[PDB]
Design an enzyme around this catalytic site. Structure first.
Site, PDB file in Angstrom:
ATOM      1  N   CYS A   1      27.453 -14.755  16.201  1.00  0.00           N
ATOM      2  CA  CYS A   1      27.269 -16.215  15.386  1.00  0.00           C
ATOM      3  C   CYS A   1      26.086 -16.995  16.484  1.00  0.00           C
ATOM      4  O   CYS A   1      26.019 -17.775  15.899  1.00  0.00           O
ATOM      5  CB  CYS A   1      28.314 -17.200  15.771  1.00  0.00           C
ATOM      6  SG  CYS A   1      29.716 -16.008  14.363  1.00  0.00           S
TER       7      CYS A   1
ATOM      8  N   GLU B   1      25.454 -18.411  19.553  1.00  0.00           N
ATOM      9  CA  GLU B   1      25.796 -19.727  19.453  1.00  0.00           C
ATOM     10  C   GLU B   1      26.302 -19.374  21.217  1.00  0.00           C
ATOM     11  O   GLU B   1      26.553 -20.899  21.806  1.00  0.00           O
ATOM     12  CB  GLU B   1      26.508 -20.429  19.120  1.00  0.00           C
ATOM     13  CG  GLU B   1      27.997 -21.109  18.888  1.00  0.00           C
ATOM     14  CD  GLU B   1      28.498 -20.333  19.020  1.00  0.00           C
ATOM     15  OE1 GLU B   1      28.409 -19.213  17.957  1.00  0.00           O
ATOM     16  OE2 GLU B   1      29.693 -20.173  19.398  1.00  0.00           O
TER      17      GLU B   1
ATOM     18  N   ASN C   1      26.270 -14.446  21.003  1.00  0.00           N
ATOM     19  CA  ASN C   1      27.208 -13.785  20.538  1.00  0.00           C
ATOM     20  C   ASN C   1      26.503 -13.060  19.583  1.00  0.00           C
ATOM     21  O   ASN C   1      26.086 -12.992  18.689  1.00  0.00           O
ATOM     22  CB  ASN C   1      28.228 -14.484  20.218  1.00  0.00           C
ATOM     23  CG  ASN C   1      28.505 -15.617  19.226  1.00  0.00           C
ATOM     24  OD1 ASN C   1      27.205 -16.170  20.132  1.00  0.00           O
ATOM     25  ND2 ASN C   1      29.515 -16.155  18.723  1.00  0.00           N
TER      26      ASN C   1
END
Ligand SMILES: Cc1cn([C@H]2C[C@H](O)[C@@H](COP(=O)(O)OP(=O)(O)OP(=O)(O)O)O2)c(=O)[nH]c1=O
Ligand SMILES: Nc1nc2c(ncn2[C@H]2C[C@H](O)[C@@H](COP(=O)(O)OP(=O)(O)O)O2)c(=O)[nH]1
Ligand SMILES: Nc1nc2c(ncn2[C@H]2C[C@H](O)[C@@H](COP(=O)(O)OP(=O)(O)O)O2)c(=O)[nH]1
Ligand SMILES: [Mg+2]
Ligand SMILES: [Mg+2]
Ligand SMILES: [Mn+2]
Ligand SMILES: [Mn+2]
Ligand SMILES: [Mn+2]
Ligand SMILES: [Mn+2]
Lengths: 683, 289, 289, 683
Positions: free
Chosen positions: D377, D379, D375
């Site tokens: 981020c 994670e 994603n």
């Protein structure tokens, strides 16, 4: 240096004080005999050639299977029976470089001019051998030229769409904006120019569902569309071209215009997106009286009245908008906006100017919708309905998006053959066939409007060539007299053919009953005014040809009332850019830019005298820049009164012309009934 | 019509010598023959010496005589690249490949070399002949500058590009490629400034300036052929280098808005792998007809 | 003993105005009074003029007369900064904050402003009086350059710093701080070159050079007072700015190796508040742990 | 100057050689009694407050209608009975500036911390009063913190979605690219961060229907997506954030990376689009052996094999692709590509690095699909299936697009309360409710995957805070021992809660029977290896809390085999950016960057000491830049072995270390089983 290139270059070598215009016949003869006949694939019989073309994925077997091979052979015989010769080197060069079918490696030539014309005619006729022969005679005589998409792609397996002009309405929603981007990329992928109406989009600093000052305006959508057109670059072949239209009373009009400034920031400037401005009569009235004008936020108007600002008549609604406290607006100077428009057109040729009330005062389908914007070439003026593209799970409300099929009469060849009626009717039939055979699977509104409206565009070209080859100055009143009579006849026979098609098929276009054709209001000026030539010289040009009279127009009005009208729109004069060389014709109804055209192809420079240029008619081929733009406006307004759609009207300006002169030309065009202004070309 | 665009392209191409680590070149340098090492050293010194003239005189003298604040700024930027970036880059390459005593000797040799001196002094002579407020003398110097940037460097660039295209001396080859990319844009820009002067001249004066440019090109070209044989015969490359010189001579002419002089030739594939009218207000009565 | 460290400092300070987004100043600009906006535009226009001449004329001419390729490289880099970076940044600020007509008007205003014309006349006159191989004329121009770098800019710098210190116009202020950071090192460097020439003289000659420097400073100072009053009276700050320019005059003298000339004063504390990774190749052993 | 920020600035005034840390308590006390209590709207009773909030479109009536007002009153009493006090000024400031409800004019404060927590708890419980009280106790004790979207929008009428991470698979078609742009704008409009996989897109210079060198590559789609995210920016307060992921074996990998170079041109560089690179073990092996690697043209592989390149195993098909003549490949140097990756991360922090075989060797749902990208981020690591968006008239084949609801355990407060089991189970229930109440009606694949997979992400924060406040160094083996035991226990109780939810609801996630939970292979290391703490210091930290043994894991494995699992994915450790201040916790499981964090808000400067920072634990709060990244990799890999999804792993680099050091850290992370690397932050 090729022999034909050398021969073509000897035109500029002045012998006995005159250009050697006869060298271009030698140039084209050398070009053929040395390159074309060498690089033309020849087959023992036409059957072998046809089999090779269908089996090697060059042609479509569907349309060729509609004829026995004897009929196709006779059609090809008819094409070659004319023994057509390209008069100039540039005609043959343009055809064999742009439209002639080449091998998959682009090394050899499969199609001659006659083969291309025969294939196009066989595709047009759709199984009729006599109709195919009629189309062959029409095109080999070069009386009618199908548009570049139709002429290039008809009867080809690996072809683009036969339509290249599309007009999309964009609704004020993220769903509709994303769908507009998708449809623009899909249509640009097919090779078509896409015009988008951005007037419904709410301006910058508008509220998005209770979050005020959150909208980026029409310029964010402009950037999205510019990148969409840059990505959908027609498989890297030709740069993706699109147009955006905004009403002059839209709040973002100044931001809309700032995208074309030379000093524009890279986060504002758009590169591949042409811009057109729609100007109602209210703006011209406000600028005329120097009253300070107001541009409105469209979403406030939509919230207050339930209708889009561009869906309403600004002439009656402007005072109500201004006096409404719930409608948001900012003061502008309409004269300053006009001067900014003229400055932008001088600098970059943009925006296109569409006079909204000039279009809609003679629009025959105002019941369906008013004409709100034009195409990328500023000649398509048709009613559109915006689509409501909902969420993915929901059902979309499909509207009408404009897309018309283009064809051009060769005025010189139609006039010399005395075949206005026959050429107009056959061109109408071919354009109707192209309209029916067009099915676009990713633009639902375009497909729905093509099926419902059945609109076609039949243009004309070689007006200046025909006039100069007949000793008539383009700005002369006799030229306008000829244009009046010729385009009245073209309109008469296009209406007659449309009503005949409606009678044959028993169907009219959708919502025909509300049109001015149904009520007879369209025919008022034709049953009241006589459009026969007022000059003996012009009346002699139409000798042997029946010019429709007032009684003929009354009979046509009765026929249309009885049987209806098949096409909502029939006539639009497109620029006709590259097909003019092949037809040895001057582009569209515009006057010639240059007497002799100097162009460079590859590393060799080429010379193209205007068709029919000689010593006797040298000064009748007056260059457009040397002309009075007021008289060109007069000519186009004379033609425009017989064209139901618009005309691609390019302004040809000198370097000495000021902003005030361009504004004066625009205001005189508005005064004379000009619907659209295409380009400001400066010398 | 062009200075702001060139400003942008110039400043976005900014780079520094320190960005490329040079030490890993010693892993291919040690495997070259004496003739290869000798040619490389001599070519490198040739480029260094010519580029110093361009930094100390060529660019600053043109910046001095050209009118226009924005043009002076672009020209200043180009002069900076010669003196602050290119000169340090050439020095860095030398210091990496040769010991101090070898560098001093190569520069002594190339400084005395007849073919290097002939071209260096021909170019410098035209820069020294510019006269205040005389656009003809400025044009002649611009032609000389374009010939240096777009043509004379290339008999030299050939060799580093030849190695670079083979996987040899990759770090110094990367540096040379960045330098060459700067000289290309310098040549195009100065070329546009020369065309501006050329286009202000009469037809007779134009024909005279064309004759000047072709005559100068011929003198430099004949010396380049001798320079080329002098350096490249010992490594068997002169035939291909000559094709590269002519190809770049044609680019230099095109930069000056002139036709190519030499027939089109293919280039060594290893080297290829290395490579506003007037605003007037509406005063009423313009809305009435 | 110093050029190399100045070379490294100058090149590591390299920047472009486009690195700083300016649309964040739009609101604090909109909120200033008409008097404040007028003074601000004019102040930056005066700065633009100074940098235009420092880049076009001052730095290139000093570069021409100073010996040594490294010294020339530093001076060439500084010249580029003046006209390709500094002078241009002001246009970035103008184009963001002001409409074209206001921009046109302020550039017309620089042409007709008598104090700005006088200071340009005096400084550029000294630059153009430099005679080849004449160290005294060169010293005089270097004094003029130090006075431009370390004294004359400061009547202009005051106002962006004054706003920056109040948390206003902070993006424009960031640009100005970068410009100021550059001029500080430019003034020191040119000061050191001037001291080199001064230190070669007899005591009698030195006494005359101090007279020249002090007479020139006083003449420039008296003109700057009138300029300061003309710009700042409408915003109520003339006395404060005067203290600031005296402070910086002392810094200019110190850059030249001379004692401070004006007595110390308290400067507005608001104005005081207004003040790649190395590439190493991977080894085989780096892939095992 | 405000009194509270003046008191907060007295922390840095060193008295007797020590920071005045107690000033922050006075700072927050002054902040409250001088700003918050003054600006807080207070009602006579809670009934008037709730009526005012519901009537004025602040809350949602539907979720508040499931409780009688006595139950809501009891919940609010439970929230206020704790008498929660913010320990620092930054905690209260961040809450009342980012998450506290304010009036429509952003003038006064409607919600306190207790009000927001009670509303979130009543939203979670969905009619259950006791469950609402349990959620109130969980959040007021700050044992569990719902993510910023959920905590900010739970129970609010004019709200965005409760999910902000979305992952989209883009198919190799113009229809799919247009749909990807549309869905990206729709999800960015909702406030979510969107990640897109661009590996299935064919490279630059590939054919589009037998015309070669026609495709613009992934960089054209990257520009389209970048402008789509710039357009959908939600007022620009939080501009649209997107991420693009490309497999390292894609031919466009070098152009994909060149979009982040500082010297990139405006026609190539993307600004609002983060980039990630998916690296299979094959690439690392090729770089290790210094062999010649090959990047491939995806369309050639799809034509030859019928499958996309990223849908195939590169470690088993790379040699087949290289040996296949019909596959088009380009020669690259894998070590040069690794060095370029390191240089790009040093200069910009990009790309994100996903070690594909590290993700998929432990991935529990490889039967559904392999994890192909992460994603925004870096994670979220879940199986995705690409959709087949067809023409307008045709039905679309909807795939599975990833999205999970985020929530963080506070390790310090969970360990203090000895409530790992209860906190994990209640957080799992809350995340399940957030998943069930999410319905994205403009992203069909996101909606389908949310209904089918039922994936949640339960993260943790305050790991470094807990260790530093317990006298444990982050790099110490005792810290890794604690992380091992803690996250094994979290995994145990999350699996237990998922199995209990599946048993209660009688349904598992789609295609559960093919997962490793169903086969029991997931529990191998849990039934074979004991994860009890190996150090007596760590073992006392878990005193009073039962640590599951191998027998407990065998019982849980039997329970899962007999009842199934409700969530395909349960645990993912997100960055937890701004909620860390509110919870007075260190961000995520990463080490702290600064001991005392200095920030400027408007024209005010304020300092934030790390939670619990003092002189007795000053050196246990070692900054992330001063510690060995190898030991941080060891810690993250210890945690990662109990996390089914990934961990947002930021690399904290000094200026002294070269690109070789960054490459060594990346290779050690790949060796140690690190799934993703988020950022290369340099000081
Ligand atoms: C239409 C178009 C596609 N593409 C690229 C993006 C898509 O990933 C890829 C596929 O386009 P498609 O939309 O699938 O085109 P197609 O189906 O007609 O071609 P094919 O038979 O090969 O599938 O082509 C461009 O780069 N530019 C374009 O204008
Ligand atoms: N032979 C031949 N004819 C071609 C070709 N392309 C177009 N034609 C046209 C020329 C004639 O008008 C028509 C029939 O040609 P044919 O098959 O040779 O006929 P025929 O004269 O033997 O009866 O086809 C072509 O490649 N070969
Ligand atoms: N009175 C009041 N109570 C509020 C408000 N916001 C939250 N509360 C909480 C405080 C108590 O825990 C709970 C009940 O408050 P109340 O309605 O005044 O009841 P009571 O104090 O008469 O029992 O609601 C608020 O605005 N007013
Ligand atoms: Mg809406
Ligand atoms: Mg496809
Ligand atoms: Mn150089
Ligand atoms: Mn150069
Ligand atoms: Mn400066
Ligand atoms: Mn300076």
């Amino acid at each position: 240096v090729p022999k034909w290139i050398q021969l073509n270059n000897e035109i500029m070598i002045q012998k006995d004080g005159k250009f050697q215009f006869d060298k271009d016949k030698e140039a084209v003869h050398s070009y053929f005999v040395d390159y074309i006949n060498q690089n033309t694939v020849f087959f023992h019989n036409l059957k072998e050639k046809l089999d090779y073309l269908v089996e090697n994925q060059y042609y479509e077997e569907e349309f060729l299977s509609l004829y026995s091979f004897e009929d196709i052979k006779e059609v090809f015989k008819t094409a070659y029976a004319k023994k057509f010769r390209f008069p100039s080197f540039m005609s043959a060069f343009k055809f064999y470089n742009d439209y002639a079918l080449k091998t998959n490696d682009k090394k050899k030539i499969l199609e001659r001019y006659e083969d291309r014309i025969s294939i196009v005619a066989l595709f047009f006729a759709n199984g009729d051998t006599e109709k195919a022969k009629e189309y062959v005679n029409l095109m080999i005589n070069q009386e009618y030229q199908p548009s570049t998409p139709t002429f290039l792609n008809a009867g080809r397996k690996r072809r683009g769409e036969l339509v290249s002009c599309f007009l999309l309405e964009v609704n004020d929603s993220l769903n509709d904006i994303s769908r507009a981007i998708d449809i623009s990329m899909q249509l640009s992928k097919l090779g078509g120019g896409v015009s988008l109406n951005l007037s419904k989009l709410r301006a910058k600093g508008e509220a998005i569902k209770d979050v005020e000052n959150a909208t980026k305006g029409v310029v964010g959508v402009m950037k999205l569309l510019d990148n969409a057109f840059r990505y959908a670059d027609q498989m890297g072949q030709r740069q993706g071209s699109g147009a955006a239209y905004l009403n002059i009373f839209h709040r973002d009009i100044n931001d809309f215009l700032d995208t074309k400034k030379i000093s524009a920031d890279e986060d504002v400037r758009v590169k591949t997106l042409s811009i057109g401005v729609v100007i109602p009569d209210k703006f011209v009235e406000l600028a005329r009286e120097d009253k300070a004008a107001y541009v409105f936020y469209p979403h406030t108007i939509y919230k207050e009245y339930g209708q889009h600002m561009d869906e309403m008549d600004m002439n009656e609604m402007y005072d109500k908008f201004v006096d409404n406290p719930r409608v948001k607006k900012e003061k502008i100077n309409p004269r300053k906006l006009l001067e900014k428009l003229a400055m932008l057109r001088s600098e970059s040729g943009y925006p296109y100017i569409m006079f909204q009330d000039n279009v809609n005062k003679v629009h025959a389908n105002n019941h369906i919708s008013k004409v709100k914007f034009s195409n990328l070439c500023s000649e398509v003026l048709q009613a559109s309905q915006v689509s409501s593209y909902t969420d993915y799970d929901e059902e979309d409300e499909i509207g009408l998006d404009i897309s018309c099929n283009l064809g051009s009469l060769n005025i010189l060849n139609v006039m010399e053959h005395k075949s206005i009626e026959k050429t107009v009717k056959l061109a109408t039939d071919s354009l109707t066939h192209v309209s029916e055979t067009t099915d676009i699977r990713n633009a639902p509104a375009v497909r729905r409007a093509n099926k419902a409206m059945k609109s076609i565009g039949l243009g004309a070209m070689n007006l200046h060539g025909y006039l100069a080859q007949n000793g008539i100055a383009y700005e002369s009143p006799e030229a306008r007299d000829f244009a009046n009579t010729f385009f009245m006849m073209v309109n008469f026979y296009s209406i007659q053919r449309s009503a005949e098609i409606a009678k044959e098929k028993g169907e009219t276009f959708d919502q025909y009953e509300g049109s001015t054709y149904a009520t007879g209001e369209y025919f008022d000026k034709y049953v009241s005014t006589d459009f026969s030539p007022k000059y003996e010289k012009i009346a002699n040009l139409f000798e042997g040809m029946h010019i429709p009279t007032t009684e003929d127009w009354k009979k046509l009005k009765a026929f249309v009332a009885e049987h209806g009208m098949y096409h909502s729109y029939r006539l639009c004069i497109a620029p006709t850019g590259s097909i003019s060389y092949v037809q040895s014709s001057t582009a569209s109804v515009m006057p010639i830019m240059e007497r002799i055209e100097e162009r460079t192809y590859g590393n060799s420079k080429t010379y193209y005298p205007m068709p029919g240029l000689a010593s006797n008619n040298w000064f009748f081929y007056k260059e457009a820049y040397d002309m009075d733009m007021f008289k060109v406006v007069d000519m186009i307004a004379t033609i425009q009164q017989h064209i139901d759609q618009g005309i691609s009207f390019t302004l040809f300006l000198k370097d000495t012309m000021t902003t005030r002169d361009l504004n004066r030309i625009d205001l005189y065009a508005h005064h004379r009934g000009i619907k659209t202004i295409y380009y400001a070309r400066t010398k | 019509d062009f200075t702001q665009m060139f400003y942008n392209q110039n400043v976005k191409q900014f780079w520094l010598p320190e960005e490329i680590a040079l030490n890993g070149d010693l892993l291919t340098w040690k495997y070259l023959g004496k003739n290869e090492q000798d040619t490389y050293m001599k070519v490198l010194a040739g480029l260094t010496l010519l580029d110093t003239e361009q930094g100390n005189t060529g660019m600053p003298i043109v910046a001095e005589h050209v009118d226009g604040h924005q043009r002076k700024a672009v020209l200043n930027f180009m002069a900076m690249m010669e003196n602050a970036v290119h000169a340090k880059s050439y020095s860095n390459i030398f210091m990496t490949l040769a010991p101090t005593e070898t560098i001093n000797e190569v520069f002594e040799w190339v400084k005395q070399n007849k073919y290097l001196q002939k071209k260096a002094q021909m170019i410098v002579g035209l820069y020294k002949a510019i006269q205040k407020d005389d656009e003809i003398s400025l044009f002649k110097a611009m032609v000389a500058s374009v010939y240096l940037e777009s043509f004379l460097f290339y008999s030299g660039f050939y060799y580093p590009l030849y190695f670079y295209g083979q996987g040899k001396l990759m770090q110094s080859g990367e540096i040379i490629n960045l330098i060459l990319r700067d000289e290309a844009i310098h040549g195009v820009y100065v070329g546009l400034l020369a065309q501006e002067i050329y286009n202000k001249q009469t037809e007779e004066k134009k024909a005279e300036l064309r004759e000047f440019a072709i005559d100068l090109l011929n003198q430099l070209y004949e010396n380049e052929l001798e320079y080329t044989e002098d350096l490249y015969d010992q490594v068997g490359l002169s035939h291909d280098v000559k094709k590269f010189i002519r190809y770049n001579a044609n680019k230099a002419l095109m930069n000056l808005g002139f036709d190519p002089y030499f027939e089109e030739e293919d280039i060594n594939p290893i080297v290829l792998n290395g490579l506003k009218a007037t605003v007037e207000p509406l005063k009423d009565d313009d809305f009435y007809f």
